[PDB]
């Protein structure tokens with residue numbers, strides 16, 4: 001473990017196969033990509049990029065220099081499930097804009113909501129009204145939500161504001177931090193401003209988001225056939241894998257992703273020779 005870069009399989013000292021760069025999921029680390037690694041060719045290196053702060057573009061501003069430090073002009077293979085897919089895609093845009101050679105972008109069910117999630121004050125009220133209802137059922141009666149305070153804050157400020165009010169009661173630090181970061185990682189998916197990308201993108205597409213994901217944001221109950229990426233990616237390939245979003249990263253479904261991805265890496269390795 002080195003900063004935000006986790007070594008899943010080290011590359012040899014010099015030479016060897018093109019590394020696969022994986023990006024962490026919402027609320028998790030790149031350890032989730034080990035089953036994928038087992039389904040990729042022998043001696044395929046893999047490095048995982050862990051959580052950093054900011055907007056998607058601000059996070060890619062931190063990732064891209066590190067990617068270039070590790071791999072130079074390319075070839076770049078960028079892969080991500082959940083939020084990691086959006087992160088991989090933003091890095092692809094950043095690397096291509098600097099003239100780097102991006103050969104593969106693999107989105108593992110990084111599927112946009114079927115209806116756009118507005119970034120408006122009305123949506124802040126709707127969002128927190130929903131969460132308040134969850135806190136009433138699962139725990140109490142909740143007073144009027146101070147909407148005027150919330151709508152001036154960003155997502156990090158909103159959740160800190162609510163945690164501060166909840167204290168004034170007692171929640172363990174480890175649980176608060178895990179929920180906070182998982183919540184913030186998911187909101188980062190919602191608020192991502194997707195830019196056009198002119199390279200080939202491979203979208204492994206499950207059947208649907210899992211139930212808990214839909215409970216937090218019901219617009220995820222519907223997906224478009226292109227997963228919301230077609231309008232930004234003209235060179236888009238979709239690989240149906242079935243199942244639920246939460247299963248896409250695990251055996252047995254990852255075998256389908258890995259079999260397809262292994263073929264793509266093989267062609268990349270051939271084209272280097």
Ligand SMILES: CCOC(=O)c1c(-c2ccccc2)oc2ccc(O)c(CN(C)C)c12
Nearest residue numbers: 179182183186187189190212213216217220
């Ligand atoms: C268990 C799945 O939960 C999540 O999907 C979300 C959490 C969450 C909160 C606390 C713990 C874990 C996840 O917070 C969110 C906020 C907005 C939102 O759209 C989503 C849905 N995502 C698929 C994007 C979530």
